[PDB]
């Protein structure tokens, strides 16, 4: 379907998205 | 000063023509030439498709724009062929109304945005001078199981495997202070900006620019192989929307100077590399930039990350932000596009351009050694820069008279930064040290260095430590 907003602050990196 | 880079001046002076063979279908004689067999321009689309080149180079693109401009009837006013896109509403427009959000007019109101895959790329290729540079960066992850972020230093030069190409040539990686985790990492933006300002200044004295960023997304596949998961591929994502936004911010902070742009700059040569598993479960590198449309979206604060990594979320209109209709040219498997609504979220790969990467073969590498002295900000890996470490690294060599070994030791990016941080050497002596580390003819500089007061003082300080 469609995603929600994931607005992380500058300088925060995230990779834990489900495969 | 605000002059163009040497590589840009050089490529502007090249014509980039691609000769062709005469054809069976040509209508002229046994000799001669026509539009069907004449040399191709450097931007030729079919040439690039034929040789599997995904984007034309920046200078091919600029020459293409110039040729189209030269088709105007003469006398007409000159227009710069390049312009950085700007999607921001003018919040100070008083053209028969009060400014946003209290009024709007055709002069201040952003019109509908249409996104499409960018046909050119500012940089075509990323060349790492030594595999040791990348492998030591990756070792942060190997040791900790935590991800890692770094800034790349080097320069730009010509790349001959595409018409009028440019490569970023990476000489070293500097890792800023960061809190690393298994599935991400966090930096204090102010702290990092302040630190990198100082590293930029020192790296410039070595003839280096900050030319990109690099990060890991590595996860052991659980097979004892040392193999890792492939997360990034055609059926998932290549760069997440978060990473595209990060790349856009960096590109805008590192503008490419161009005299052919209305603004005196156009996009950026700053590159983004990701280290992650390939389809075979091997650790590999992928290189990217983001489009000028991405730069403008992010400058206008129009997009956010989303919970689906392949998708950017579009933000709402507020008193500070104006978001018009936004569309994108959605491609099918044949590359044919159809205009579709980009709201509320759209695939971020339309904002990506891909670069190739590689290593040179066996050598104008700036630093002889890439490893052996602890890199910055690695205390959590048990690798700290202190007197004890510097003594272990350098002391016996500095007193052996072996200038080959001394040269190998001091020709080392992180070593040089640490020594300069001690403020023992004078500016003159610091310059001698840099010359000893990066010049082709280094021995004369090193002899002067070792005889200097500041160096003898450093050596004594080391001797009397531990
Ligand atoms: Zn012909
Ligand atoms: Zn207005």
Residue numbers in the entry:
A (entry chain C): 287 to 305
B (entry chain A): 112 to 473, 477 to 580
What does the study report here?
Polyubiquitylated proteins in isolation can be direct targets of the proteasome, whereas those embedded into membranes or assembled into multisubunit complexes need to be extracted or segregated by the conserved AAA-family ATPase Cdc48 (yeast) or p97/VCP (metazoan) with the aid of its cofactor complex, Ufd1–Npl4 (UN), prior to the proteasomal degradation. The UN heterodimer is one of the best-characterized cofactors. Here, we present the crystal structures of yeast Npl4 (zf-Npl4-MPN-CTD) in complex with Lys48-linked diubiquitin (K48-Ub2) and with Ufd1 at 2.55 and 1.58 Å resolutions, respectively. The crystal structures reveal that the distal and proximal Ub (Ubdist and Ubprox, respectively) moieties of K48-Ub2 interact with the C-terminal helix and N-terminal loop (N loop) of Npl4 CTD, respectively, and that Ufd1 binds to the groove of Npl4 corresponding to the catalytic groove of JAMM.
To further reveal the structural basis of the interaction between Npl4 and Ufd1, we determined the crystal structure of yNpl4113–580 (E123A K124A E125A) in complex with yUfd1288–305. In the crystal, yNpl4113–580 formed a stoichiometric complex with yUfd1288–305. No large conformational difference was observed between yNpl4113–580 alone and the yUfd1288–305-bound yNpl4113–580. In the complex, residues 298–300 of yUfd1 NBM form a β-sheet with Ins-1 of yNpl4. Leu296, Phe326, Leu353, Met357, Phe419, Pro420, and Tyr424 of yNpl4 form a hydrophobic groove to accommodate Pro289, Leu292, Leu294, Gly297, Leu299, Phe301, Phe303, and Met305 of yUfd1. Gly is more favorable than non-Gly/Pro residues at residue 297. yUfd1 NBM is kinked at Gly297, thereby fitting into the hydrophobic groove in the MPN subdomain of yNpl4. Although the sequence of Ufd1 NBM is variable among eukaryotes, this GxΦxF motif (x and Φ represent any amino acids and hydrophobic amino acids, respectively) is well conserved, reflecting its functional importance. Leu296 and Phe326 of yNpl4 interact with Leu299 and Phe301 of yUfd1, which occupy the third and fifth positions of the GxΦxF motif, and Tyr424 of yNpl4 hydrophobically interacts with the main-chain CO group of Ala290 and the Cα atom of Lys291 in yUfd1. In addition to the hydrophobic interactions, Arg364 and Thr418 of yNpl4 form hydrogen bonds with Glu296 and the main-chain NH group of Ala290 in yUfd1, respectively. However, the present yNpl4113–580–yUfd1288–305 structure reveals that the groove of the MPN domain accommodates yUfd1 NBM.
